[PDB]
């Protein structure tokens, strides 16, 4: 019903938003008397210094912290520092049979991709027939993985293919 | 002097002319080569790899022979060449700590050069200075050289050689700093 | 200097100066005692109402209510009111704005309520202390009783244009190289600035364009330094 | 027509389905099924107005950069390269269709690397003197990049320099180099750094 104040606020185009002060605050401070509605001091520096500057994007850090201790990830030659951010050089040190460490180079944390790249595979897989079967199984599983993810999905599929294709 | 000369040099855009001009520039430096090259390195090279303007400047293929001149004058400076030109004898009177082998001016000069070489190899920012130090390492192919001498006193650059692996027989040669035990160890490291 | 009068026997400056030697009270009589015609200068006189009239009214009203505050936590309290000459200038201002209200109805209200105008008794008590504050005179007790009580026309929250302190001789300084930690004359002092708000030396911090139409006298007057206002800063519009 | 063909190809290619992906015992098709899909696609488009096939070729790229699936992108690139090797799917058309409209400079660096490896493998693409034109577009993608991107994508993005160096070096046996010069003239007006 009181659209008059609405059309008046619409009229309030000029920059001098101080006439409303003299218009309203006299009666407001008269009938309401909280001159200090917040006498608590408020002086904090918003941005002094806050940055990691000493590691990779911590997203993959928090991800890899969840994985099973049977996966041992290390650091490769420095080519995945910030943008690529991942050189998944992992060892499956556990009670199961060991194998060749995967590469699994994923992309920036935006994740418009996954990890499996398999650079050093060309000679690591075709040499051993059993490892060749392992690679075949791992490829067939990865192709059936809809939009696999950085560390969890890739490493899980790799381990399950390695310990399923034993036969 | 060197600042104007280099600034006017960064417009050739014709690699033949660039090589010609840089060879002549090394030529003119004589009779003052030591101090001239020292100041040139210590003043341009830090700025030449730290400012975006200097980045875009050295971003040209002509910039390839800059490090060629650098290593060419560095060895001549490290050599026991007096070059006491009486025309410049009275002028050679300075005093500078250089903001740091031995406690020798050219020594800590080359040391700061090594430090800047390592810093330009720093990750998280792949600028044209990365390609610059890449060309520099490529031009380090020489004999009786002093580039990254790797002396047993405090020579750190050898560790940065590992970062050069991110960029090979050239690695095998550059890692061969002083045939030291730790030198052999880092050579083996680079070998893999 | 706004006296754009018709040519008369004397100048408006000396006439307004001698206006101090006037009757005791009832400025409505003083105006007819001196003159009332040759004071209009513009039909668009609506410039001091939103900017100066409320300001001078608040100043004089604080000067009023300051009298009962004799036992303040200060030997002179908040102010002195022992000059009279400045009060004479204030009386010239109030009588000329009375003439303005007679001409332009955009006069200075009492700003609260009950104008039953109301500046009459105000001017009366100002003159009552004036005879106590003209020259070689002491301050009076009847005026105390006259000012003590307050009407339904007494607001508060005056600007009191001053500068923030800097008492770091050898005692204390809470600052760094950057990151100032937070803790006006023509009005334009909202809760949070939403315009240019050109910072200044002490208190001004006035807007740069000021959205003016004919008040350019003030803007053209404060382009250079100001009184304790040479410290024209560019404090950002970090409104919060 | 083309829309129904793309729908059929997507329904055939998208064989990945995580149905009860729990670690259960629910029980190299990447080569035989790939050839089967290639043969089905060739038999479909063989009688589907091949005159506009090149347009549909670009439509193929619509599905190329759809999924992220880097292993699947590599597999798709390999099988389409093999299908080109069967005489069908002329190489110039498919490379021209794949290079543009999906470049995504640094947006898909993995897709960039795989696409450049593919075009390097299919860099044969024997045709008339109107081949170096594609090189122009390549340089365009190198132009939309300042050399201050990231220390990680250096050798990854180096595939461009690798493929261009291969092209210009094998120009002694690949294509006349003076045409390459008159093509790269579109980048520099006789000296432009």
* 3-state secondary structure labels for all residues of chain B: CHHHHHHHHCCCCCHHHHHHHHHHHHHHCCCCHHHHHHHHHHHHHHHHCCCHHHHHHHCCHHHHHHHHHHHHHHHHHHCCCCCCCHHHHCCCCCCCCCCCCCCCHHHHHHHHHHHHHHHHCCCCCCCHHHHHHHHHHHHCCCCCCCCCCCCCCCCCHHHHHHHHCCCCHHHHHHHCCCCCHHHHHHHHHHHC
DSSP H or E segment with residue A91: strand A89-91
Q: Which residue, among A13, A14, A18, would best test binding to C if mutated, counting the most C CBs under 10 Å from its CB?
A: A18
**Please, where are the H alpha helices in chain D?**
2-13, 29-46, 53-64, 70-85, 91-99, 109-121, 132-143, 159-170, 177-184
Which residues of chain C come before a gap where C and the next N are over 2.5 Å apart? 116, 140, 183
- Residues C211, A30: C-beta atoms closer than 8 Å: no
Which experimental technique did the depositors report for determining this structure?
cryo-EM
Query: What chain C residue is nearest to A22 in terms of C-alpha separation?
Result: C111
Question: Positive or negative, the Cα torsion across D95, D98, D103, D109?
Answer: negative
Q: Could you tell me which residues are beta bridge partners of residue A74? A: A89
DSSP H or E segment with residue A162: helix A152-164
Q: Which chain D residues contact residue B61 at CB under 8 A?
A: 193
Closest CA to B76 of B42, B27, B21: B27
DSSP state of D9: H
Of chain B residues 155-174, which have a CB less than 8 A from chain A? Answer: 163, 165-166
Contact D64, D106 (CB under 8 A): no
Phi, psi at A3, each rounded to 5°: -75, -5
Tokens of A26: 């006299």
What is the C-alpha end-to-end distance of chain B, expressed in Å? 45
Cβ of B10 under 8 Å from any chain D Cβ?
Answer: no
- Residues D16, A145: C-beta atoms closer than 8 Å: yes
Closest CA to C187 of C53, C27, C25: C53
- Residues B123, A77: C-beta atoms closer than 8 Å: no
- Residues C211, A21: C-beta atoms closer than 8 Å: no
Instruction: Tabulate helix, strand, coil % of chain C (nearest 5).
Output: 30, 0, 70
- Residues A147, D68: C-beta atoms closer than 8 Å: yes
Cα distance between residue B81 and residue B34, in whole Å: 9
Tokens of A74: 């290390």
Q: Which chain C residues contact residue A26 at CB under 8 A?
A: 111-112, 155
Query: What chain D residue is nearest to A79 in terms of C-alpha separation?
Result: D152
Residue with tokens 């200060």: C74
For C167, half-sphere exposure in the C-beta direction (CA atoms, 13 angstrom radius) is 3
Three-class SS of residue D2? helix
Select from B123, B165, B166 the Cβ nearest to the Cβ of A82.
B123
Phi, psi at A74, each rounded to 5°: -125, -170
Cα distance between residue D32 and residue D36, in whole Å: 6
Question: Positive or negative, the Cα torsion across D107, D113, D119, D122?
Answer: negative
* Contacts (Cβ under 8 Å, ≥6 apart) of A131: A99, A100, A124, A125
Residue with tokens 């860099």: D123
DSSP state of C61: H
Contact B176, B168 (CB under 8 A): no
Tokens of A111: 């994740």
Distance (Å) from the alpha carbon of B61 to chain D's nearest alpha carbon: 8
Contact B81, B161 (CB under 8 A): no
- Residues A78, B163: C-beta atoms closer than 8 Å: yes
Neighbours of D44 (CB within 10 A): 14
Three-class SS of residue D20? coil
The DSSP code sequence of C144-177 is: HHHHHS--TT---------------SSS-----S
Our CA angle for D69, D72, D74, nearest 5°, is 110
Three-class SS of residue C33? helix
What is the C-alpha end-to-end distance of chain A, expressed in Å? 80
Experimental structure resolution, Å: 4.7
Contact D153, A84 (CB under 8 A): yes
Distance (Å) from the alpha carbon of D154 to chain B's nearest alpha carbon: 7
Neighbours of C206 (CB within 10 A): 22
Of chain D residues 96-135, which have a CB less than 8 A from chain A? Answer: 106-111
Q: How far is CA A139 from the centre of its chain?
A: 26
Cβ of B59 under 8 Å from any chain D Cβ?
Answer: yes
DSSP H or E segment with residue A72: strand A72-74
Cα distance between residue B105 and residue D145, in whole Å: 41
Rounded to the nearest 10 degrees, the angle between the axes of helix B105-120 and helix B33-48 is 20
Closest CA to C134 of C78, C64, C82: C82
């Amino acid at each position: 019903q009181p659209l008059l104040d609405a059309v008046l606020a619409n009229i309030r185009s000029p920059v001098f938003n101080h006439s409303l002060y003299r218009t309203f605050v006299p009666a407001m401070m008269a009938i309401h008397g909280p001159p200090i509605v917040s006498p608590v001091v408020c002086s904090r520096k918003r941005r002094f210094e806050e940055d990691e500057r000493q590691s990779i994007p911590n997203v993959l850090q928090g991800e890899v912290a969840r994985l099973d201790p049977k996966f041992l990830v290390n650091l490769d030659p420095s080519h995945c520092s910030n943008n690529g951010t991942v050189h998944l050089i992992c060892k499956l040190d556990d009670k199961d049979l060991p194998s060749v460490p995967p590469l699994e180079l994923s992309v920036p944390a935006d994740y418009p991709a996954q990890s499996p790249m398999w650079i050093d595979r060309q000679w690591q897989y075709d040499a051993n027939p059993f490892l060749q079967s392992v690679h075949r199984c791992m490829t067939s599983r990865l192709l059936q993985l809809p939009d696999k993810h950085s560390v969890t999905a890739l490493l899980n599929t790799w381990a399950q293919s390695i310990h399923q294709a034993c036969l | 002097f060197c600042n104007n000369l280099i600034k006017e040099l960064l417009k050739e855009t014709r690699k033949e002319h660039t090589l010609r001009a840089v060879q002549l520039l090394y030529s003119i430096f004589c009779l003052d080569m030591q101090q001239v090259t020292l100041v040139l390195l210590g003043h341009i090279l830090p700025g030449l790899l730290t400012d975006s303007s200097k980045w875009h400047s050295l971003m040209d293929p002509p910039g390839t022979a800059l490090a060629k001149l650098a290593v060419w004058c560095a060895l001549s400076s490290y050599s026991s060449h007096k070059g006491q030109a009486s025309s410049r004898q009275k002028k050679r009177h300075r005093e500078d700590i250089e903001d740091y082998n031995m406690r020798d001016p050219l020594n800590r000069v080359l040391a700061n050069l090594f430090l800047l070489i390592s810093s330009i190899l720093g990750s998280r920012t792949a600028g044209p200075h990365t390609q610059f130090v890449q060309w520099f390492m490529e031009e380090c192919v020489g004999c009786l050289e002093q580039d990254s001498r790797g002396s047993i006193l405090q020579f750190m650059p050898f560790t940065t050689v590992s970062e050069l692996v991110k960029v090979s027989p050239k690695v095998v040669l550059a890692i061969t700093d002083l045939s030291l035990p730790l030198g052999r160890q880092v050579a083996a490291k680079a070998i893999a | 200097p706004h006296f754009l009068n018709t040519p008369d026997k004397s100048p408006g400056d000396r006439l307004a100066e001698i206006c101090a030697k006037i009757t005791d009270v009832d400025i409505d009589k003083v105006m007819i005692n001196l003159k009332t015609e040759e004071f209009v200068l513009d039909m668009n006189t609506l410039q001091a109402l939103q900017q100066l009239l409320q300001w001078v009214g608040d100043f004089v009203l604080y000067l009023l209510v300051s009298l009962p505050n004799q036992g303040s936590p200060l030997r002179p309290g908040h102010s002195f009111l022992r000059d009279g000459t400045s009060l004479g200038m204030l009386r010239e201002l109030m009588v000329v704005i009375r003439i303005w209200g007679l001409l332009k109805p955009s006069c200075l209200p009492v700003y609260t309520a009950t104008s039953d105008d109301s500046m009459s008794l105000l001017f009366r008590l100002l003159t009552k202390l004036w005879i106590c504050c003209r020259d070689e005179g002491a301050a009076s007790p009847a005026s105390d009783g006259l000012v003590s009580r307050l009407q339904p026309k007494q607001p508060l929250r005056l600007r009191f244009g001053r500068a923030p302190t800097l008492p770091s001789s050898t005692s204390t300084l809470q600052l760094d190289g950057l990151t100032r930690a937070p803790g006006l004359h023509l009005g334009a002092y909202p809760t949070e600035e939403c315009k240019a708000c050109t910072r200044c030396g002490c208190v001004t911090m006035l807007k740069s364009p000021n959205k003016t139409t004919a008040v350019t006298q003030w803007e053209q007057r404060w382009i250079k330094n100001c009184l304790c206002g040479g410290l024209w800063r560019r404090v950002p519009l970090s409104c919060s | 027509m083309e829309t129904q063909l793309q729908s059929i190809f997507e329904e055939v290619v998208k064989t990945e389905i995580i149905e009860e992906a729990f670690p259960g015992m629910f029980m190299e098709d990447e080569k035989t099924k790939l050839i089967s899909c290639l043969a089905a696609f060739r038999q479909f488009w063989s009688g589907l107005s091949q005159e506009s096939h090149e347009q549909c070729v670009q439509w193929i790229v619509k599905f190329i950069h759809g999924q992220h699936s880097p292993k699947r992108i590599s597999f798709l690139y390999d099988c389409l390269a093999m299908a080109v090797e069967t005489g069908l799917l002329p190489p110039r058309m498919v490379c021209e269709s794949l290079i543009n409209s999906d470049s995504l400079e640094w947006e898909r660096t993995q897709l960039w690397a795989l696409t450049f490896k593919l075009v390097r493998k299919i860099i044969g693409g024997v045709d008339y003197k109107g081949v170096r034109d594609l090189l122009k577009a390549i340089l365009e993608k190198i132009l939309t990049i300042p050399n201050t991107v990231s220390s990680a994508v250096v050798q990854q993005l180096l595939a461009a320099r690798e493929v261009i160096a291969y092209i210009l070096e094998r120009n002694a046996c690949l294509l006349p180099a003076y045409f390459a010069v008159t093509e790269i003239r579109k980048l520099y007006p006789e000296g432009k750094l």
